């Protein structure tokens, strides 16, 4: 909502490509161009800690490079074994021809007694 991370020009991403987005002190994101639409998840495969931005898109499915598990990039839901834990999904907006991913940070929670 408030936090947006500038990735690159929309024209800098060919369809079927992934860009990794690093966040100082937080988990990296993967931004995917599927044809003419943009999606984002956590970059880190929930199964065995691989970088999904080093994988292969097959339409709207990201194939993990380590064990060939896979996720739907739109839903974050597992699409191939051995993946069982869904990815966090992040909103992506193109603003003035530039790709931004939501920082979906400001997750804030106090000590309960
Ligand atoms: S690390 Fe991704 S499928 Fe195992
Ligand atoms: Na495939």
């Amino acid at each position: 909502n408030q936090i947006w991370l500038k990735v690159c020009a929309a024209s800098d991403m060919q369809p079927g490509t992934i860009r990794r987005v690093n966040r100082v002190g937080a988990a990296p994101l993967a931004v995917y161009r599927v044809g003419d639409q943009f999606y984002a998840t956590e970059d880190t495969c929930t199964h065995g800690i691989a970088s999904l931005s080093e994988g292969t898109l097959d339409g709207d499915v990201i194939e993990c490079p380590f064990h060939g598990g896979a996720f739907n990039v739109c839903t974050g839901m597992p699409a191939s074994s051995p993946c069982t834990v869904p990815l966090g999904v992040f909103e992506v907006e193109v603003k003035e021809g530039e790709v931004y991913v939501a920082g979906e940070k400001k997750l804030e929670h106090h000590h309960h007694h």
Side-chain angles (χ1 to χ4, degrees), residues 46-92:
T46 59
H47 177 250
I49 303 303
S51 178
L52 295 176
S53 58
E54 291 169 10
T56 302
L57 281 163
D58 188 337
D60 41 31
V61 175
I62 183 57
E63 301 171 343
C64 178
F66 206 59
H67 307 114
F71 299 90
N72 186 287
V73 300
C74 302
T75 66
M77 294 296 296
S80 188
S81 66
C83 295
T84 70
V85 177
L87 300 164
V89 298
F90 298 69
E91 192 174 348
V92 180

mmCIF file of all heavy atoms in Angstrom, residues 46-92:
data_model
loop_
_atom_site.group_PDB
_atom_site.id
_atom_site.type_symbol
_atom_site.label_atom_id
_atom_site.label_comp_id
_atom_site.label_asym_id
_atom_site.label_seq_id
_atom_site.Cartn_x
_atom_site.Cartn_y
_atom_site.Cartn_z
ATOM 1 N N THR A 46 10.222 -22.336 -1.026
ATOM 2 C CA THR A 46 9.850 -22.749 0.352
ATOM 3 C C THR A 46 10.387 -24.140 0.669
ATOM 4 O O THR A 46 10.506 -24.460 1.861
ATOM 5 C CB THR A 46 8.346 -22.666 0.580
ATOM 6 O OG1 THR A 46 7.725 -23.512 -0.383
ATOM 7 C CG2 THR A 46 7.875 -21.235 0.525
ATOM 8 N N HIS A 47 10.689 -24.937 -0.349
ATOM 9 C CA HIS A 47 11.124 -26.339 -0.190
ATOM 10 C C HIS A 47 12.583 -26.404 0.286
ATOM 11 O O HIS A 47 12.827 -26.907 1.378
ATOM 12 C CB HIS A 47 10.888 -27.119 -1.481
ATOM 13 C CG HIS A 47 11.376 -28.513 -1.371
ATOM 14 N ND1 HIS A 47 12.489 -28.927 -2.071
ATOM 15 C CD2 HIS A 47 10.944 -29.564 -0.633
ATOM 16 C CE1 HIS A 47 12.694 -30.216 -1.813
ATOM 17 N NE2 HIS A 47 11.782 -30.613 -0.897
ATOM 18 N N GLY A 48 13.544 -26.002 -0.532
ATOM 19 C CA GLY A 48 14.975 -26.186 -0.223
ATOM 20 C C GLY A 48 15.835 -24.964 -0.518
ATOM 21 O O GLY A 48 17.050 -25.167 -0.822
ATOM 22 N N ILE A 49 15.259 -23.753 -0.462
ATOM 23 C CA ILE A 49 16.003 -22.478 -0.261
ATOM 24 C C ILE A 49 16.663 -21.984 -1.558
ATOM 25 O O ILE A 49 17.517 -21.076 -1.489
ATOM 26 C CB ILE A 49 17.058 -22.679 0.847
ATOM 27 C CG1 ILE A 49 16.422 -23.160 2.154
ATOM 28 C CG2 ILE A 49 17.875 -21.432 1.057
ATOM 29 C CD1 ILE A 49 15.346 -22.250 2.696
ATOM 30 N N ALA A 50 16.269 -22.508 -2.705
ATOM 31 C CA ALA A 50 16.793 -22.057 -4.006
ATOM 32 C C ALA A 50 16.243 -20.664 -4.310
ATOM 33 O O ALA A 50 15.220 -20.259 -3.719
ATOM 34 C CB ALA A 50 16.426 -23.030 -5.083
ATOM 35 N N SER A 51 16.894 -19.964 -5.236
ATOM 36 C CA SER A 51 16.374 -18.694 -5.799
ATOM 37 C C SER A 51 15.478 -19.013 -7.003
ATOM 38 O O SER A 51 15.981 -19.474 -8.044
ATOM 39 C CB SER A 51 17.506 -17.752 -6.115
ATOM 40 O OG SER A 51 17.013 -16.570 -6.692
ATOM 41 N N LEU A 52 14.180 -18.732 -6.893
ATOM 42 C CA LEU A 52 13.242 -18.913 -8.026
ATOM 43 C C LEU A 52 13.591 -18.021 -9.227
ATOM 44 O O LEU A 52 13.282 -18.417 -10.346
ATOM 45 C CB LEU A 52 11.799 -18.712 -7.553
ATOM 46 C CG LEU A 52 11.315 -19.760 -6.555
ATOM 47 C CD1 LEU A 52 9.931 -19.424 -6.070
ATOM 48 C CD2 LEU A 52 11.339 -21.156 -7.165
ATOM 49 N N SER A 53 14.208 -16.856 -9.022
ATOM 50 C CA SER A 53 14.623 -15.963 -10.137
ATOM 51 C C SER A 53 15.752 -16.606 -10.959
ATOM 52 O O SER A 53 16.105 -16.025 -11.994
ATOM 53 C CB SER A 53 15.026 -14.610 -9.649
ATOM 54 O OG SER A 53 16.079 -14.730 -8.715
ATOM 55 N N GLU A 54 16.293 -17.750 -10.539
ATOM 56 C CA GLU A 54 17.284 -18.530 -11.346
ATOM 57 C C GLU A 54 16.574 -19.693 -12.050
ATOM 58 O O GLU A 54 17.256 -20.514 -12.698
ATOM 59 C CB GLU A 54 18.437 -18.980 -10.451
ATOM 60 C CG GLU A 54 19.322 -17.835 -9.968
ATOM 61 C CD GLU A 54 20.319 -18.204 -8.864
ATOM 62 O OE1 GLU A 54 20.477 -19.417 -8.578
ATOM 63 O OE2 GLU A 54 20.933 -17.278 -8.263
ATOM 64 N N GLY A 55 15.250 -19.802 -11.896
ATOM 65 C CA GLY A 55 14.447 -20.861 -12.515
ATOM 66 C C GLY A 55 13.956 -20.526 -13.911
ATOM 67 O O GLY A 55 14.558 -19.687 -14.611
ATOM 68 N N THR A 56 12.912 -21.226 -14.323
ATOM 69 C CA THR A 56 12.345 -21.220 -15.686
ATOM 70 C C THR A 56 10.849 -21.002 -15.566
ATOM 71 O O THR A 56 10.206 -21.794 -14.856
ATOM 72 C CB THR A 56 12.632 -22.553 -16.389
ATOM 73 O OG1 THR A 56 14.063 -22.693 -16.387
ATOM 74 C CG2 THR A 56 12.047 -22.599 -17.779
ATOM 75 N N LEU A 57 10.304 -20.034 -16.291
ATOM 76 C CA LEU A 57 8.831 -19.910 -16.404
ATOM 77 C C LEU A 57 8.294 -20.843 -17.486
ATOM 78 O O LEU A 57 8.882 -20.955 -18.570
ATOM 79 C CB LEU A 57 8.459 -18.464 -16.722
ATOM 80 C CG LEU A 57 8.485 -17.517 -15.538
ATOM 81 C CD1 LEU A 57 8.507 -16.073 -16.009
ATOM 82 C CD2 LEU A 57 7.294 -17.785 -14.609
ATOM 83 N N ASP A 58 7.162 -21.457 -17.201
ATOM 84 C CA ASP A 58 6.379 -22.258 -18.154
ATOM 85 C C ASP A 58 4.967 -21.685 -18.063
ATOM 86 O O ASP A 58 4.246 -22.051 -17.118
ATOM 87 C CB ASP A 58 6.492 -23.735 -17.812
ATOM 88 C CG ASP A 58 5.887 -24.669 -18.845
ATOM 89 O OD1 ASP A 58 4.999 -24.234 -19.610
ATOM 90 O OD2 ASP A 58 6.335 -25.851 -18.862
ATOM 91 N N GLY A 59 4.663 -20.708 -18.916
ATOM 92 C CA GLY A 59 3.469 -19.852 -18.767
ATOM 93 C C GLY A 59 3.464 -19.139 -17.425
ATOM 94 O O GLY A 59 4.404 -18.373 -17.166
ATOM 95 N N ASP A 60 2.433 -19.353 -16.599
ATOM 96 C CA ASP A 60 2.309 -18.667 -15.287
ATOM 97 C C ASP A 60 2.895 -19.553 -14.180
ATOM 98 O O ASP A 60 2.631 -19.271 -13.045
ATOM 99 C CB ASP A 60 0.860 -18.271 -14.993
ATOM 100 C CG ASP A 60 -0.136 -19.345 -15.380
ATOM 101 O OD1 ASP A 60 0.260 -20.545 -15.295
ATOM 102 O OD2 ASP A 60 -1.280 -18.975 -15.841
ATOM 103 N N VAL A 61 3.658 -20.586 -14.516
ATOM 104 C CA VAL A 61 4.321 -21.433 -13.492
ATOM 105 C C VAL A 61 5.835 -21.194 -13.465
ATOM 106 O O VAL A 61 6.474 -21.293 -14.511
ATOM 107 C CB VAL A 61 3.995 -22.913 -13.695
ATOM 108 C CG1 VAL A 61 4.780 -23.761 -12.724
ATOM 109 C CG2 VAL A 61 2.504 -23.138 -13.551
ATOM 110 N N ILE A 62 6.369 -20.911 -12.270
ATOM 111 C CA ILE A 62 7.838 -20.844 -12.059
ATOM 112 C C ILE A 62 8.314 -22.234 -11.631
ATOM 113 O O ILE A 62 7.825 -22.755 -10.611
ATOM 114 C CB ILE A 62 8.249 -19.753 -11.051
ATOM 115 C CG1 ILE A 62 9.770 -19.687 -10.950
ATOM 116 C CG2 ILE A 62 7.610 -19.943 -9.682
ATOM 117 C CD1 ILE A 62 10.457 -19.439 -12.276
ATOM 118 N N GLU A 63 9.284 -22.762 -12.363
ATOM 119 C CA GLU A 63 9.987 -24.031 -12.076
ATOM 120 C C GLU A 63 11.271 -23.723 -11.301
ATOM 121 O O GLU A 63 12.132 -23.016 -11.825
ATOM 122 C CB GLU A 63 10.271 -24.783 -13.373
ATOM 123 C CG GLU A 63 9.013 -25.089 -14.141
ATOM 124 C CD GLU A 63 9.208 -25.655 -15.538
ATOM 125 O OE1 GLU A 63 10.331 -25.533 -16.072
ATOM 126 O OE2 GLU A 63 8.215 -26.236 -16.085
ATOM 127 N N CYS A 64 11.365 -24.252 -10.078
ATOM 128 C CA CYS A 64 12.528 -24.094 -9.190
ATOM 129 C C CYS A 64 13.749 -24.766 -9.818
ATOM 130 O O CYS A 64 13.661 -25.912 -10.252
ATOM 131 C CB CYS A 64 12.251 -24.759 -7.847
ATOM 132 S SG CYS A 64 13.679 -24.623 -6.751
ATOM 133 N N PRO A 65 14.924 -24.119 -9.848
ATOM 134 C CA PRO A 65 16.101 -24.739 -10.461
ATOM 135 C C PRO A 65 16.729 -25.874 -9.639
ATOM 136 O O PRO A 65 17.493 -26.637 -10.203
ATOM 137 C CB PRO A 65 17.057 -23.541 -10.585
ATOM 138 C CG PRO A 65 16.703 -22.646 -9.438
ATOM 139 C CD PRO A 65 15.199 -22.771 -9.332
ATOM 140 N N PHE A 66 16.427 -26.011 -8.346
ATOM 141 C CA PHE A 66 17.164 -26.975 -7.496
ATOM 142 C C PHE A 66 16.542 -28.374 -7.653
ATOM 143 O O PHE A 66 17.305 -29.300 -8.104
ATOM 144 C CB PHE A 66 17.293 -26.455 -6.065
ATOM 145 C CG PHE A 66 18.499 -27.024 -5.372
ATOM 146 C CD1 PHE A 66 19.775 -26.827 -5.894
ATOM 147 C CD2 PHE A 66 18.360 -27.823 -4.248
ATOM 148 C CE1 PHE A 66 20.882 -27.393 -5.278
ATOM 149 C CE2 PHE A 66 19.468 -28.389 -3.634
ATOM 150 C CZ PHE A 66 20.726 -28.167 -4.146
ATOM 151 N N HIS A 67 15.245 -28.537 -7.368
ATOM 152 C CA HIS A 67 14.562 -29.859 -7.402
ATOM 153 C C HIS A 67 13.394 -29.900 -8.383
ATOM 154 O O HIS A 67 12.687 -30.905 -8.369
ATOM 155 C CB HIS A 67 14.014 -30.306 -6.041
ATOM 156 C CG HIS A 67 15.031 -30.273 -4.959
ATOM 157 N ND1 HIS A 67 14.930 -29.400 -3.901
ATOM 158 C CD2 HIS A 67 16.177 -30.970 -4.788
ATOM 159 C CE1 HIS A 67 15.975 -29.571 -3.105
ATOM 160 N NE2 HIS A 67 16.752 -30.537 -3.629
ATOM 161 N N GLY A 68 13.183 -28.863 -9.186
ATOM 162 C CA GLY A 68 12.081 -28.895 -10.167
ATOM 163 C C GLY A 68 10.696 -28.897 -9.527
ATOM 164 O O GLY A 68 9.720 -29.206 -10.232
ATOM 165 N N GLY A 69 10.571 -28.512 -8.254
ATOM 166 C CA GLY A 69 9.271 -28.069 -7.721
ATOM 167 C C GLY A 69 8.798 -26.859 -8.509
ATOM 168 O O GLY A 69 9.565 -26.342 -9.352
ATOM 169 N N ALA A 70 7.576 -26.419 -8.306
ATOM 170 C CA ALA A 70 7.051 -25.277 -9.073
ATOM 171 C C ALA A 70 5.902 -24.618 -8.320
ATOM 172 O O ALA A 70 5.325 -25.263 -7.413
ATOM 173 C CB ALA A 70 6.635 -25.712 -10.457
ATOM 174 N N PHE A 71 5.643 -23.358 -8.662
ATOM 175 C CA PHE A 71 4.583 -22.527 -8.057
ATOM 176 C C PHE A 71 3.863 -21.783 -9.156
ATOM 177 O O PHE A 71 4.527 -21.379 -10.128
ATOM 178 C CB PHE A 71 5.152 -21.491 -7.093
ATOM 179 C CG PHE A 71 5.897 -22.096 -5.939
ATOM 180 C CD1 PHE A 71 7.259 -22.335 -6.030
ATOM 181 C CD2 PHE A 71 5.234 -22.420 -4.757
ATOM 182 C CE1 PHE A 71 7.953 -22.881 -4.972
ATOM 183 C CE2 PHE A 71 5.942 -22.945 -3.688
ATOM 184 C CZ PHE A 71 7.291 -23.187 -3.801
ATOM 185 N N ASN A 72 2.564 -21.555 -8.978
ATOM 186 C CA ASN A 72 1.819 -20.590 -9.825
ATOM 187 C C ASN A 72 2.263 -19.189 -9.383
ATOM 188 O O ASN A 72 2.144 -18.917 -8.190
ATOM 189 C CB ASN A 72 0.316 -20.780 -9.687
ATOM 190 C CG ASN A 72 -0.431 -19.885 -10.654
ATOM 191 O OD1 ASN A 72 -0.497 -18.680 -10.463
ATOM 192 N ND2 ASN A 72 -1.034 -20.472 -11.669
ATOM 193 N N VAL A 73 2.782 -18.338 -10.275
ATOM 194 C CA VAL A 73 3.315 -16.996 -9.885
ATOM 195 C C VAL A 73 2.197 -16.011 -9.497
ATOM 196 O O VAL A 73 2.475 -15.019 -8.771
ATOM 197 C CB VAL A 73 4.246 -16.412 -10.965
ATOM 198 C CG1 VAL A 73 5.449 -17.318 -11.231
ATOM 199 C CG2 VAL A 73 3.518 -16.109 -12.250
ATOM 200 N N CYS A 74 0.974 -16.251 -9.970
ATOM 201 C CA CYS A 74 -0.227 -15.412 -9.712
ATOM 202 C C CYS A 74 -0.760 -15.673 -8.300
ATOM 203 O O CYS A 74 -1.190 -14.716 -7.614
ATOM 204 C CB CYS A 74 -1.312 -15.764 -10.726
ATOM 205 S SG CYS A 74 -0.813 -15.562 -12.453
ATOM 206 N N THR A 75 -0.790 -16.935 -7.878
ATOM 207 C CA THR A 75 -1.407 -17.348 -6.587
ATOM 208 C C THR A 75 -0.368 -17.635 -5.498
ATOM 209 O O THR A 75 -0.770 -17.665 -4.318
ATOM 210 C CB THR A 75 -2.294 -18.579 -6.780
ATOM 211 O OG1 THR A 75 -1.476 -19.686 -7.140
ATOM 212 C CG2 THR A 75 -3.383 -18.353 -7.809
ATOM 213 N N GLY A 76 0.872 -17.942 -5.907
ATOM 214 C CA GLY A 76 1.938 -18.429 -5.030
ATOM 215 C C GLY A 76 1.735 -19.878 -4.644
ATOM 216 O O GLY A 76 2.517 -20.368 -3.851
ATOM 217 N N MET A 77 0.724 -20.561 -5.179
ATOM 218 C CA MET A 77 0.377 -21.910 -4.676
ATOM 219 C C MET A 77 1.307 -22.925 -5.315
ATOM 220 O O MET A 77 1.665 -22.792 -6.480
ATOM 221 C CB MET A 77 -1.085 -22.249 -4.971
ATOM 222 C CG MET A 77 -2.038 -21.379 -4.210
ATOM 223 S SD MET A 77 -1.939 -21.602 -2.419
ATOM 224 C CE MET A 77 -2.468 -23.308 -2.264
ATOM 225 N N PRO A 78 1.711 -23.991 -4.603
ATOM 226 C CA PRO A 78 2.490 -25.060 -5.232
ATOM 227 C C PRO A 78 1.819 -25.600 -6.502
ATOM 228 O O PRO A 78 0.614 -25.783 -6.511
ATOM 229 C CB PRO A 78 2.557 -26.148 -4.146
ATOM 230 C CG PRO A 78 2.353 -25.413 -2.893
ATOM 231 C CD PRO A 78 1.358 -24.324 -3.216
ATOM 232 N N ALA A 79 2.608 -25.899 -7.528
ATOM 233 C CA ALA A 79 2.121 -26.435 -8.815
ATOM 234 C C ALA A 79 2.838 -27.741 -9.161
ATOM 235 O O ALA A 79 2.315 -28.494 -9.979
ATOM 236 C CB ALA A 79 2.272 -25.415 -9.920
ATOM 237 N N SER A 80 4.005 -28.003 -8.584
ATOM 238 C CA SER A 80 4.687 -29.297 -8.765
ATOM 239 C C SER A 80 5.417 -29.719 -7.483
ATOM 240 O O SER A 80 6.006 -28.883 -6.814
ATOM 241 C CB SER A 80 5.592 -29.210 -9.981
ATOM 242 O OG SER A 80 6.122 -30.486 -10.281
ATOM 243 N N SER A 81 5.400 -31.009 -7.166
ATOM 244 C CA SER A 81 6.225 -31.592 -6.077
ATOM 245 C C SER A 81 7.687 -31.305 -6.388
ATOM 246 O O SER A 81 8.088 -31.253 -7.556
ATOM 247 C CB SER A 81 6.016 -33.074 -5.944
ATOM 248 O OG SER A 81 6.498 -33.714 -7.110
ATOM 249 N N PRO A 82 8.556 -31.155 -5.369
ATOM 250 C CA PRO A 82 8.213 -31.422 -3.962
ATOM 251 C C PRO A 82 7.683 -30.256 -3.120
ATOM 252 O O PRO A 82 7.607 -30.369 -1.913
ATOM 253 C CB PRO A 82 9.582 -31.882 -3.442
ATOM 254 C CG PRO A 82 10.555 -31.026 -4.187
ATOM 255 C CD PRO A 82 9.988 -30.887 -5.583
ATOM 256 N N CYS A 83 7.286 -29.168 -3.768
ATOM 257 C CA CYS A 83 6.794 -27.949 -3.079
ATOM 258 C C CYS A 83 5.398 -28.167 -2.497
ATOM 259 O O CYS A 83 4.537 -28.719 -3.200
ATOM 260 C CB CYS A 83 6.781 -26.777 -4.042
ATOM 261 S SG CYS A 83 8.461 -26.377 -4.563
ATOM 262 N N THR A 84 5.215 -27.780 -1.234
ATOM 263 C CA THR A 84 3.956 -27.929 -0.464
ATOM 264 C C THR A 84 3.589 -26.626 0.234
ATOM 265 O O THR A 84 2.383 -26.440 0.530
ATOM 266 C CB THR A 84 4.038 -29.095 0.531
ATOM 267 O OG1 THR A 84 4.937 -28.745 1.574
ATOM 268 C CG2 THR A 84 4.459 -30.376 -0.144
ATOM 269 N N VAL A 85 4.567 -25.770 0.547
ATOM 270 C CA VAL A 85 4.308 -24.515 1.288
ATOM 271 C C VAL A 85 4.152 -23.368 0.293
ATOM 272 O O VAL A 85 5.084 -23.096 -0.457
ATOM 273 C CB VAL A 85 5.411 -24.203 2.307
ATOM 274 C CG1 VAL A 85 5.128 -22.869 2.973
ATOM 275 C CG2 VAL A 85 5.575 -25.321 3.324
ATOM 276 N N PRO A 86 2.988 -22.684 0.242
ATOM 277 C CA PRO A 86 2.797 -21.559 -0.682
ATOM 278 C C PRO A 86 3.754 -20.377 -0.428
ATOM 279 O O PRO A 86 4.224 -20.172 0.699
ATOM 280 C CB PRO A 86 1.351 -21.089 -0.443
ATOM 281 C CG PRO A 86 0.690 -22.238 0.289
ATOM 282 C CD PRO A 86 1.797 -22.891 1.085
ATOM 283 N N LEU A 87 4.090 -19.688 -1.514
ATOM 284 C CA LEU A 87 4.855 -18.423 -1.512
ATOM 285 C C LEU A 87 3.924 -17.289 -1.101
ATOM 286 O O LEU A 87 2.761 -17.276 -1.531
ATOM 287 C CB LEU A 87 5.439 -18.130 -2.898
ATOM 288 C CG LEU A 87 6.403 -19.150 -3.465
ATOM 289 C CD1 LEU A 87 6.598 -18.946 -4.968
ATOM 290 C CD2 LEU A 87 7.729 -19.119 -2.712
ATOM 291 N N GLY A 88 4.502 -16.320 -0.407
ATOM 292 C CA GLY A 88 3.948 -14.980 -0.255
ATOM 293 C C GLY A 88 3.777 -14.358 -1.621
ATOM 294 O O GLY A 88 4.683 -14.495 -2.463
ATOM 295 N N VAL A 89 2.669 -13.678 -1.836
ATOM 296 C CA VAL A 89 2.444 -12.941 -3.109
ATOM 297 C C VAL A 89 2.524 -11.441 -2.826
ATOM 298 O O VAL A 89 2.074 -10.978 -1.727
ATOM 299 C CB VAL A 89 1.129 -13.348 -3.789
ATOM 300 C CG1 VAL A 89 1.143 -14.834 -4.156
ATOM 301 C CG2 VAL A 89 -0.087 -12.993 -2.967
ATOM 302 N N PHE A 90 3.079 -10.698 -3.772
ATOM 303 C CA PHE A 90 3.230 -9.218 -3.664
ATOM 304 C C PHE A 90 2.593 -8.577 -4.888
ATOM 305 O O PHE A 90 2.885 -9.008 -5.993
ATOM 306 C CB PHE A 90 4.699 -8.815 -3.514
ATOM 307 C CG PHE A 90 5.336 -9.368 -2.267
ATOM 308 C CD1 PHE A 90 5.576 -10.729 -2.126
ATOM 309 C CD2 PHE A 90 5.605 -8.545 -1.181
ATOM 310 C CE1 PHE A 90 6.121 -11.244 -0.961
ATOM 311 C CE2 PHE A 90 6.142 -9.063 -0.013
ATOM 312 C CZ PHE A 90 6.411 -10.410 0.094
ATOM 313 N N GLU A 91 1.793 -7.537 -4.682
ATOM 314 C CA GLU A 91 1.245 -6.682 -5.767
ATOM 315 C C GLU A 91 2.365 -6.052 -6.616
ATOM 316 O O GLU A 91 3.430 -5.666 -6.073
ATOM 317 C CB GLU A 91 0.354 -5.588 -5.175
ATOM 318 C CG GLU A 91 -0.462 -4.858 -6.225
ATOM 319 C CD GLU A 91 -1.475 -3.861 -5.654
ATOM 320 O OE1 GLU A 91 -1.704 -3.894 -4.414
ATOM 321 O OE2 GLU A 91 -2.026 -3.046 -6.444
ATOM 322 N N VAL A 92 2.139 -5.973 -7.923
ATOM 323 C CA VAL A 92 3.058 -5.336 -8.910
ATOM 324 C C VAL A 92 2.259 -4.292 -9.680
ATOM 325 O O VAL A 92 1.179 -4.648 -10.174
ATOM 326 C CB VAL A 92 3.694 -6.333 -9.888
ATOM 327 C CG1 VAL A 92 4.621 -5.596 -10.859
ATOM 328 C CG2 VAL A 92 4.442 -7.438 -9.160
#
